[PDB]
Design a protein around this ligand. Sequence first.
Ligand code: CLA
Ligand code: CLA
Ligand code: CLA
Ligand code: CLA
Ligand code: CLA
Ligand code: BCR
Ligand code: SF4
Ligand code: SF4
Lengths: 80, 144, 37, 40, 165, 75, 733, 124
Amino acid sequence: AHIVKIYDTCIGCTQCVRACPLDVLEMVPWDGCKASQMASAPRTEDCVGCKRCETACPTDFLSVRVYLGSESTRSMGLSY
Amino acid sequence: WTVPTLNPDTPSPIFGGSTGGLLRKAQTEEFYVITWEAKKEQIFEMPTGGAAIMRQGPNLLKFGKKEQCLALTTQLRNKFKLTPCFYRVFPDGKVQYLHPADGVYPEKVNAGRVGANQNMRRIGQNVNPIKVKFSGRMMSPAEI
Amino acid sequence: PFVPPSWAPSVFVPLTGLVLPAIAMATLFVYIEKEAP
Amino acid sequence: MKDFTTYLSTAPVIATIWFTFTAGLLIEINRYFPDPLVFS
Amino acid sequence: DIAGLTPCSESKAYAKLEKKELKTLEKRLKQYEADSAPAVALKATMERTKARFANYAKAGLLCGNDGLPHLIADPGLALKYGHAGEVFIPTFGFLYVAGYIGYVGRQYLIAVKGEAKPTDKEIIIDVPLATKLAWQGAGWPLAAVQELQRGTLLEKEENITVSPR
Amino acid sequence: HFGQLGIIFIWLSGMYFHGARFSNYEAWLSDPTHIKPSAQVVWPIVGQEILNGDVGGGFQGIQITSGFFQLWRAS
Amino acid sequence: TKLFPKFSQGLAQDPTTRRIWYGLAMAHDFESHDGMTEENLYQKIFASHFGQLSIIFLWTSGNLFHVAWQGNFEQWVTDPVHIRPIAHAIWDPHFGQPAVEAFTRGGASGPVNISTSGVYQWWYTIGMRTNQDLYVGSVFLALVSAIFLFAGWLHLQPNFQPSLSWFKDAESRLNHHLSGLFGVSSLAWTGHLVHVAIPESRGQHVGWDNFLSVLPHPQGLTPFFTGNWAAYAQSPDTASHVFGTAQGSGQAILTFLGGFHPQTQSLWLTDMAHHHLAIAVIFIVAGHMYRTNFGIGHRMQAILEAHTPPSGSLGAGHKGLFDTVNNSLHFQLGLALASVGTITSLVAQHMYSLPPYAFQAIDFTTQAALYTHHQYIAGFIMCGAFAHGAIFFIRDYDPEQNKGNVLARMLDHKEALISHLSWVSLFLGFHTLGLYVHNDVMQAFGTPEKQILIEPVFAQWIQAAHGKALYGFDFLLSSKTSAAFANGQSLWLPGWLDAINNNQNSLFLTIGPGDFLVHHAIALGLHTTTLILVKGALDARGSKLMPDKKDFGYSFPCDGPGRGGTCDISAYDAFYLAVFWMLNTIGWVTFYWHWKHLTLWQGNVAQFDESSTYLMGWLRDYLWLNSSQLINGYNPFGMNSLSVWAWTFLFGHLIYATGFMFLISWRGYWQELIETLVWAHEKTPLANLVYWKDKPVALSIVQARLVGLAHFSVGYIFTYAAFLIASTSGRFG
Amino acid sequence: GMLETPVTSAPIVATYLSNLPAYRTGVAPVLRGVEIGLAHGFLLAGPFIKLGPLRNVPETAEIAGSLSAAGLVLILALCLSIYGSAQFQSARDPLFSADGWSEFAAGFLVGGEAGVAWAYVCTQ
Ligand code: CLA
Ligand code: CLA
Ligand code: CLA
Ligand code: CLA
Ligand code: CLA
Ligand SMILES: CC1=C(/C=C/C(C)=C/C=C/C(C)=C/C=C/C=C(C)/C=C/C=C(C)/C=C/C2=C(C)CCCC2(C)C)C(C)(C)CCC1
Ligand code: SF4
Ligand code: SF4
């Protein structure tokens, strides 16, 4: 499975969650940012590694990072 | 809110079929089922190609991978204002409800969710690869 | 005594070009598809 | 007229004029001083 | 002579090359009438060819065994034996013009960075400003040295972005 | 589309003009087999006039292969 | 889950055809294996090195065996000038009768291949004379191969596994390798030359059966122990000596003649014996420098800590670099590859110009093949050196432990280094290409006198300094009144000056404007290749585009379409790009070497001197003109012995072009295509009864780059090899 | 869900496929291989005989062509053997099992070689 990490520079804009085509990410309560919410990656067994989440992140440098890992049927995106 | 239970008897949208659907993986490994309630008969686009008509009321479709179910979910939500959900169905009959995980779609912050894979530092504060060398496998400094 | 027999190429060339590769491919194929306990 | 002279100041038009002028100068020098290989 | 070369004015191959080039034109000139336009064009080419071989020999170029002029690039040899006009003098001709272009462009870039929208002055040229800078670029070698001596040519390291190391 | 047609008419006009002013078409009409069609003439500069070849008909220029001479004779 | 690969559990659980590909690709990257420890890593490398050694000696055994069994070495030594060496016999049931006849050559009974490797000249020069000599050497090297293979097994056993500290004893290993592996080996080779090779070149047989009763010199070791070492330089072989016979032979065993043997046109055997004797002494002494268990010598760490310029111009200097180098296998391998890579090029440059082997110079095909062979190997080795330098920076470099030293300061001005390499490459490219194009236009318009021909006076000046009197500079060895000319006039200058002023050999060939242009093309290639490799290494850890690149490793596909798009951003991809430029550069180098020797060998250097100043000359007179015999190896009217090279020539073009498929078309296209094939197979009766165990997938992004480069590189090499051999041997065979 | 066509779902097509030995369940796997082996072994001799390197030799052509076809049958039998070893390591039809496939492969070799021999007899 790929490795997805959220870093404390997140502003809780939710754009990574909206952009994920696999429903890997979600928003959870937080107190470290004005929005009082932080991105979370609870279901990384379904991440395909497309990095649409990274494309959507506004912070500099990124607050959501994907590290490509071992390949399974799910992570490879196979329908067979 | 409580986890819904899949009803296999649900009728499926009117559709003549295609060559883009399920393969042997569904019989042996797993497949996915998406269900939603339609306010009226309407034409939508299948993620596997072609046009289908959703029946008024309950609808049910089966797909070969999770991304296909969520791709149709995005279409139904944004273009028709519906609220679909889908499951993972194993060959032995087990059903695993998937989406939305807690009844609230992930883009909306909900109470009771526990953060996962959250590092309390910036990317620039990761250690050098030399510090995790010979840890038992290949691992990034972001994994610590 | 070091000189091989005049017929050696007729045997060794087919042996290393057809027979041994066939055994090696068959052996390797079964090994790479073998399932661990 | 202000806008038209502004259009003539865009990069492609200036490049066209400047290179037409620069090429003309180099061509005309070789017309009157043919086959120059060294400076005397 | 230098590096075993010989002057083109004294080279048999150099003289033979000119005969061949003129001979090729003469053969073509036979099929045209005296006053016809093709004949006039061919003779004009012949006059230019003869002048070319006359000028290169006069300039004192060295010729190889092939009979072709060879240039001398070492400043010492060029200045000692009167070949400075081949590479050495052309060298400083280029560097003056090249620095002229570079210096004028740099001045324009700095001038427009104080404007409200610097990027608009880079796709729509401020021709009145560009023209003024072009004429003043004739003194770039003096201006450039003064900036180098005043410490204003270069930017300080603390203001230049770099990647992590 | 009118813009495209305008450009094509300029292109066609140029071909006919260069046939009228920079060609050996009249000479070619008399001896079509022994003369090479030519409708481009280069200026003498930096030695490039070698490209004006001896195409026949008391003319020097680049030999064309577009077939305009044969089209013009047919019309 | 699948067993294979055992070293990666992540790969073993991969359910696709990816796993087999990556199982092979990651097999020798020990550091990435599951459960790897530093001590076990070193022990695994040590055993692998024994495996390489046994393979090398078995490869040498095979070459000796086949020449003895199937070659014509005994016939070749009787007339090396007019006989072609035989590599091995052909047994191919696909041949037709005409092919059997065509390849039957060189005096053999059946079809054979002609050797281009030059082993005949090498073995003949060192004293081998009969097939029995070759047979015994073959058996000996097979035994040595087996011993090394056994030693690799032995040192993997519980009581024979060296500890980690043993592998990190730099001082002890350097002492032994300098004095023992370099020095004693060189001293032993001197003994062979004095006892065997030199007597054999004078018509005397010395072998194991009698070498203890034959004096290498009439005065046996008496001059050596009394200091009268000049007794061994007296009575050298005369200028009329016939190699291999006693006619005109001398008695000296250690000389400094310093030229070529007049008959063989190669280096004197007595000069090569004195060379290795002096090298042996130098290396034996050099191996007593570093400290070991005896309380004398240098500690390498102490030397490095001391060399810090007082002004602070190098910062902390070389502080911390002993641990950095000693703890990084990639820093060591990078240094080893860079050193060996440069040495391989030196071998190429010196062997053609100062041929050491008898009758090597006249074997034109062998000369061309050897230079091209070693220059291409050097090119690949240099790319690897920079590759592992970039791997070092990611995996092994520690910024805290290198704070302020020279290595950390290289990263501090990497932008200055890269941007200046960029400027040099741009200048060379613009002006070298510009001058070639200017000369092509002048040639096209029929005015060759208007082209820009810059004499290489700086290089001709160096040639004059070495004694070449053609250019008239007349100083140093070219000036008969100079101290340098006078002082050496009794040792080696007579032989050297005779050789350097003969224009029929390769010793400092005459150069002109054509040589000027191509040398700047080579500089363009070296600088651009270095730019790509250096930029790859210095940006390996991060850039403004990818600040955290070091967290992703040496090789990874990309970072996705975001931030403008990040294709080929990894340091591995920089190496992949650099290989194309290395091939282009070596291609320019070898084209230059080959064409200049083809026209010299044909007695018409003027063709090169006049055609090499413009690029149509290279296309027309080098490639097009010299392809004629090659492409007629077979045709509608028949075939000849060049048909194999004609076939290989097209074989090379085909593989080259197949590589373009992987380089241009990228994965996503193919993955979609394979899915339709997956659907079709499951829906086809009588075929869906069979099924795969690995789910088919398209090759990965990284894998496509490697495979495409492999096809590009293999086709590049084969195409030129066929052209080089066929165009040379066909001309001079 | 799936696209049904006359080619995919027809009565004549379905009946024909069920009659083939591959789809005829209730038959011993060894017998299945022999019937499949005979059919493929017989046809395989054709192209080798008529287009081999010895096609133009008067009598050697038949021997060489059929002898080469026999060699290809042996290679094919080896492919079946290793396929069963890989595919079946850990159900209704005995053919798709470790023991069944091994018997099926053995039958293919005997049937295939016999088919090649029978083809040679027909030629001469
Ligand atoms: C080094 C490897 C190698 C060797 C030794 C051979 C050998 C042969 N090839 Mg080639 N081939 C090879 C690699 C090789 N090939 C590769 C890699 C390819 C793919 C590019 C090809 C593609 C190829 C083709 C397309 C053809 C050949 C053919 C031939 C035959 C040519 C002589 C002839 O006229 O036979 C005539 C045939 C005979 C005299 C029969 C010989 C015996 C047969 C082949 C096997 C008999 C087996 C026996 C019944 C049972 C097992 C016995 C065993 C246990 C002892 C010969 C058997 C020709 C041929 O006839 O193939 C059958 C042919 O058409 N080959
Ligand atoms: C790019 C490098 C380079 C190279 C390889 C050379 C090479 C050479 N130069 Mg040149 N030179 C260069 C750049 C170079 N030069 C530059 C940039 C300049 C301008 C500053 C000069 C200015 C110059 C002069 C004034 C003279 C030479 C001379 C020479 C030749 C003999 C002297 C010598 O040993 O030079 C080797 C070069 C170096 C070690 C580098 C520094 C060279 C300095 C600048 C000149 C040294 C002159 C020397 C003391 C003269 C001795 C007496 C002479 C009669 C031999 C030699 C072929 C001499 C010659 O033969 O003139 C006809 C000479 O008189 N050069
Ligand atoms: C008999 C009437 C007629 C004629 C001759 C044409 C001719 C043409 N039409 Mg068509 N058109 C017509 C009726 C006609 N149209 C009608 C009734 C409609 C509305 C339903 C359209 C709608 C239409 C569209 C939307 C387009 C065309 C386009 C074209 C051009 C296609 C390119 C080509 O073949 O160039 C061959 C060129 C020539 C033979 C040169 C002919 C030039 C002269 C002036 C005649 C042009 C025809 C025009 C109707 C004459 C009267 C115009 C006005 C003064 C009343 C061509 C010039 C395309 C085009 O390029 O438009 C610019 C295009 O996009 N036409
Ligand atoms: C002493 C020499 C040496 C050593 C010990 C190593 C060792 C290593 N290198 Mg290095 N390397 C070297 C030289 C060396 N290298 C050279 C010379 C180059 C430049 C070419 C490189 C370039 C390089 C790169 C770019 C990389 C390494 C990597 C590695 C590591 C893994 C190797 C691996 O798994 O390969 C597995 C090898 C294969 C699967 C086979 C590859 C076959 C190639 C493509 C050629 C195929 C030719 C073809 C079959 C010919 C067919 C001919 C036809 C007619 C039949 C390992 C630590 C990798 C790493 O991750 O390091 C940390 C890595 O990415 N090396
Ligand atoms: C023949 C093919 C070719 C050419 C000409 C180039 C040229 C270049 N490469 Mg590239 N490269 C190639 C193939 C080629 N590459 C291949 C196959 C690969 C493998 C993928 C690479 C990989 C590669 C890398 C990784 C790098 C380069 C770099 C470079 C530059 C080297 C320095 C130089 O020459 O500056 C002088 C420039 C040139 C010679 C380029 C041509 C300039 C022309 C002649 C200008 C003509 C202008 C004229 C007015 C016409 C304009 C017409 C138009 C308006 C219609 C240069 C831009 C390096 C770089 O960027 O260094 C700074 C670099 O890092 N190349
Ligand atoms: C990135 C990196 C890396 C890599 C690197 C490389 C790859 C390099 C290379 C380099 C090189 C490749 C170099 C070379 C050099 C050379 C030189 C420096 C030379 C010199 C010479 C001389 C000095 C000579 C002299 C002489 C002469 C000329 C003549 C007479 C004699 C005499 C001897 C005097 C490493 C691993 C470190 C790690 C870190 C990073
Ligand atoms: S890489 Fe793609 S699938 Fe994975 S979390 Fe990011 S957007 Fe979702
Ligand atoms: S897009 Fe970036 S900033 Fe926004 S919620 Fe996701 S990780 Fe946080």
